């Protein structure tokens with residue numbers, strides 16, 4: 602596949618855009634996990650699937666029995682990897698672009714994490730869309746976090762919900778979802 606449009610999908614706590622603590626999300630938002638699954642899995646073209654790209658540490662963090670993520674082509678990046686097709690669901694690669702050369706019959710491509718991948722790939726011009734779940738909490742500071750997004754958002758535009766709706770198709774988008782003390786909303790951003 603040549604120069605596909607890629608999207609980053611991430612969940613971050615405002616205002617600092619904290620994303621994790623010692624390799625894990627500092628929250629358990631059950632509806633947000635469901636949205637992540639639907640968005641990354643759904644396709645509109647017939648014999649296609651979507652691809653998910655992740656860093657080797659994220660891959661390793663998923664319990665062996667739960668990988669690869671079903672119904673999507675999983676791509677794992679490592680600087681030590683050779684560009685190789687493991688099976689029909691798993692690709693190893695050392696760069697995003699090299700990995701995309703090995704795919705066909707893919708509709709959308711999503712970067713799913715983790716912290717290092719996000720922070721490095723936000724600056725690759727293949728990235729055209731950000732799907733950011735903006736999480737809010739009454740006392741952000743009480744949540745322990747060690748990793749943060751370092752995104753240049755001054756170079757990006759938050760679109761209206763109609764545009765997000767158009768992006769996700771059939772997926773139901775509820776507003777101000779509450780789970781425990783967290784409130785969140787789904788957003789779409791594109792480059793200026």
Ligand SMILES: CC(C)(C)c1ccc(Sc2cccc3nc(N)nc(N)c23)cc1
Nearest residue numbers: 610611612620621625637713714715716
């Ligand atoms: C390293 C950290 C812990 C930030 C990390 C965070 C998330 C993910 S994948 C993921 C899992 C569950 C829900 C998710 N929600 C959205 N919106 N984005 C993701 N990428 C998600 C993989 C790695």
